[PDB]
Amino acid sequence: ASEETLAFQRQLNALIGYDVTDVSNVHDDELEFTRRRLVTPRMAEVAGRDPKLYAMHPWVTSKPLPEYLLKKITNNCVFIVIHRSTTSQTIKVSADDTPGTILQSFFTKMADFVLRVCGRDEYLVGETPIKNFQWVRQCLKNGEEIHLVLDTPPDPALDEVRKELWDCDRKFRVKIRGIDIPVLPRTADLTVFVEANIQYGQQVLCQRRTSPKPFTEEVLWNVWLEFSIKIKDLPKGALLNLQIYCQLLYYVNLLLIDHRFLLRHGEYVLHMWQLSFNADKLTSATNPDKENSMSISILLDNYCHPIALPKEMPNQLRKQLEAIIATDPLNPLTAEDKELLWHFRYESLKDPKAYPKLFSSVKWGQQEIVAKTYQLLAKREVWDQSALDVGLTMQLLDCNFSDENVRAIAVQKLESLEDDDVLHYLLQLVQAVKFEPYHDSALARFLLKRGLRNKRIGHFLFWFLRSEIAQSRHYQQRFAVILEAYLRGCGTAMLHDFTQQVQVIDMLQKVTIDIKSLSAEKYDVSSQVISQLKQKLENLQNLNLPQSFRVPYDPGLKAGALVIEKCKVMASKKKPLWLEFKCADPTALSNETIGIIFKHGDDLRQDMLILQILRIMESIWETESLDLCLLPYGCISTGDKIGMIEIVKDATTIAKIQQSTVGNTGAFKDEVLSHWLKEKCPIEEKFQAAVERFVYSCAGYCVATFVLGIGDRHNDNIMISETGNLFHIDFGHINKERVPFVLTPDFLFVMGTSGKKTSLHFQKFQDVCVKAYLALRHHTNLLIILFSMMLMTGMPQLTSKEDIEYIRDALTVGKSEEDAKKYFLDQIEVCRDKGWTVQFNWFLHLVLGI
């Protein structure tokens, strides 16, 4: 109430990018209600987290040491280098030593502090073997030395937190007064009607319409729509989905039972959303644009105040039930399916992998059945004792499930995840909040909790939520609330860092878009815009631009001043900015700059989402002991059609390589690529390792790009580094010739296949591909749900079942390893037939605008 907290709220909203306090666009107090109930889990988390380990955010894994890593360590002994002001000595110890033992034994080698990584804010502290430290492992895989500088621990005082019924059997019914819209489309003579639906888990319980009338600024009806489902049957989380067809054009939703288990009555003037299926169609939020959006007026039974108060087998038949429990996640169920599935509730409760199927066979539209379902969840021994399955858990948090308890059990198994895992899945869990029927939920609380309990998670949770608040008006309110609750308990240091980051970004957002303004339809990096570019950075770098700030996609990296010289404007289409900074950390064991790219034009949430499935993929290969050398570079969506991207050093586009050894034409030489790498690394040893890198990097992207359904793209959207690593890029948007994945002649060439014959490295390729293509099939269900969620919360279009199903054909579900093994190796053949065919077509399409 004072001026203190008042100003505090002011800045909080500036970091969120939305005024959470705002109450102009709401028909109830669910938001504020949610802000208050979060205050508890927040404070409860702040108090329970050790200030020390928290301030140092140790990054560890309790997973085994992979086969490819176990291969490098020589008899439980690793070499590390410790630094201290010019002084540098190497000490080899067992991979099982504790960071304390590394110090205790240190003091007794040469005649209070902590071991940090040189150039990064990464501390190796805690009761864990040095082998369980991600950094340590990263160095091993890349075959790099482990240089650590001994300095003083960060004062855990910098993370200080500031001062703090079922008897109304009457049928349900709702009256539609009329829809209103200030202006209508040019093409007149239209017909429209209101379709009122009783939704739940995306399935329709009941449906009613109105008499189709001509389309005009005002279209009254004053018609009562009486449904069938009794008020006693309305389940918590049911939505009254009101829609309008002309084709569906506008839609709006409203929870029938509020956050207090009360019914909904009274008059309502809901401002609808327009349609350009997907997460947005499910939002309870109303459209803020009240001066241009279509509105609708309704009325709910002005009754009293109802309150939904809180609560042997024929062997052969079995074989039938099982055939369902073993059915892929995409194949729907039939009448008999659910009926047969339901009847044997307790028998289907013995196998976890059946829950998704079982719970979707429930008639939530019947109060009786719901009550029984909960009786089932009473004895969850079989579930609570089951081993966590992220795949399965996810399946319960999608659009198909709107029941609190059901979803709550999924969230309940997530609690079992260690910080390392929470980070692999963070993006998808954050996107899953969109399927929650209320703003306050088990999942919303779980993200808050885990964010406040670890700085890394908290860091990415900030950015992920922030991207949705800045771009999504459908969910920003709910997300603005979840963020606030996080910024109110992350500490004063993090609160400060986020400020520096937001500041730097906002200042670079202006340039990025102000520079693109000059020439857009014709890529011509003017000689004047070059001087005008460096010049703008000059104004910013004056004293308003934060000297130092953490790189959003790589929190451990601290960026300093801008190396204005190396900064430029890429001669691309959307004219992105190529910036470079110095590493703010003076203990950095190098001088290399930090490259960051700012682009406008492409939706960077897609790239974000895509790069994340990749991380998961690499992780999956880790379990099956495999390394494909993917390079999922950092990418963060910051706002509408804009964000940053990590810059991979010593890397070039595969097209530019052909456009230099040949020219700006479509004639592609097969030996060009190899000639490039050879002259890049004269040292035979490097070239010998660079060629093998390609073999793996190339294979790795071929499988991932295929399963994801994005293997067919131009040559310019693909890169290779001077170390031989090939990696795809720019995932903005993605009768004729087609190809499964890019495996051009110049690639095969570098593998030995100078023509259409087998080779040494080439055989290694096919061996690794198939090998990785199988490692992913073991996680078919996990990929299905991910690919499925990604399309519902990452694609502007109204993706359908046909869209998701592709993932099922790519993974060849229902087949044996043999059939699948050959299937993949044949796709590799489809590429051997096209050769340069496809690439040449992409050249005619993009370059020649044909």
Ligand X SMILES: O=c1cc(N2CCOCC2)oc2c(-c3ccccc3)cccc12
Nearest distance, CB of residue 668 and ligand X, angstroms: 18
Nearest distance, CB of residue 595 and ligand X, angstroms: 7
Q: Are 386 and 352 in contact (CB under 8 A)?
A: yes
- Report whether 73 belongs to an annotated binding site: no
The number of residues that bind ligand X (CB under 6 A) is 12
Task: Please report whether residue 847 would count as binding ligand X according to CB under 6 A.
Answer: no
Nearest distance, CB of residue 625 and ligand X, angstroms: 27
Name the CA radius of gyration of the chain, rounded.
29
Tokens of 469: 């608040």
Nearest distance, CB of residue 742 and ligand X, angstroms: 16
Task: Please report whether residue 701 would count as binding ligand X according to CB under 6 A.
Answer: no
Q: Are 15 and 488 in contact (CB under 8 A)?
A: no
- Report whether 598 belongs to an annotated binding site: yes
**Whose Cβ is closer to ligand X: residue 279's or residue 648's?**
648
- Report whether 782 belongs to an annotated binding site: no
**Whose Cβ is closer to ligand X: residue 659's or residue 763's?**
659
> What CA–CA distance (Å, rounded) separates 829 from 818?
17
- Report whether 731 belongs to an annotated binding site: yes
Per-residue binding letters, 521-560, with ligand X (x by CB under 6 A): ----------------------------------------
- Report whether 635 belongs to an annotated binding site: yes
Torsion of CA 117, 122, 124, 125, to 10 degrees: 140
**Whose Cβ is closer to ligand X: residue 337's or residue 646's?**
646
Segment contacting ligand X by CB under 6 A, of 94-102, 115-123, 483-491, 569-577: 569-577
- Report whether 497 belongs to an annotated binding site: no
Q: Which of 574, 469, 589 is nearest to 513 (CA)?
A: 574
> What CA–CA distance (Å, rounded) separates 797 from 476?
19
**Whose Cβ is closer to ligand X: residue 341's or residue 610's?**
610
Helices marked H in 306-366 — which ranges?
315-325, 335-343, 345-348, 355-359
Q: Which residue reads 């067809």 in tokens? A: 245
- Report whether 754 belongs to an annotated binding site: no
Residue of the chain from 572, 659, 754, 759 that contacts ligand X (CB under 6 A): 572
Sequence-separated (6 or more) residues with CB below 8 Å from residue 433 = 441, 443, 444, 447, 475, 478, 479, 482
Q: Which residue reads 């500041």 in tokens? A: 503
Nearest distance, CB of residue 840 and ligand X, angstroms: 20
Q: Please, which of residues 629-668 interact with ligand X by CB under 6 A?
A: 633, 645-648, 651, 653
How many Å separate Cα 760 from the centre of its chain?
38
Task: Please report whether residue 720 would count as binding ligand X according to CB under 6 A.
Answer: no
**Whose Cβ is closer to ligand X: residue 231's or residue 672's?**
672
Task: Please report whether residue 730 would count as binding ligand X according to CB under 6 A.
Answer: yes
Letter string b/e over residues 543-572, b meaning 16 or more CB atoms within 10 A of that residue's CB? eebbebbbbbbbbbbbbbebebeebbbeee
368 residue type, one letter: E
Nearest distance, CB of residue 657 and ligand X, angstroms: 11
**Whose Cβ is closer to ligand X: residue 41's or residue 595's?**
595
Q: Are 581 and 593 in contact (CB under 8 A)?
A: yes
CB atoms within 10 A of CB 282: 24
Nearest distance, CB of residue 577 and ligand X, angstroms: 10
**Whose Cβ is closer to ligand X: residue 330's or residue 647's?**
647
Give the single-character DSSP code of 787.
Answer: H
Nearest distance, CB of residue 599 and ligand X, angstroms: 6
Helices 419-432, 455-471: axis angle to 10 degrees equals 20
What strands lie across the sheet with 651-653, from one edge to the other? 651-653, 718-721, 726-728
Residue of the chain from 44, 570, 825, 847 that contacts ligand X (CB under 6 A): 570
Nearest distance, CB of residue 727 and ligand X, angstroms: 7
> What CA–CA distance (Å, rounded) separates 31 from 364?
26
Provide the annotated binding site: 595-604, 630-638, 727-734
- Binding residues for ligand X (CB under 6 A): 570, 572, 576, 633, 645-648, 651, 653, 729-730
Provide the annotated binding site for ATP: 595-604, 630-638, 727-734
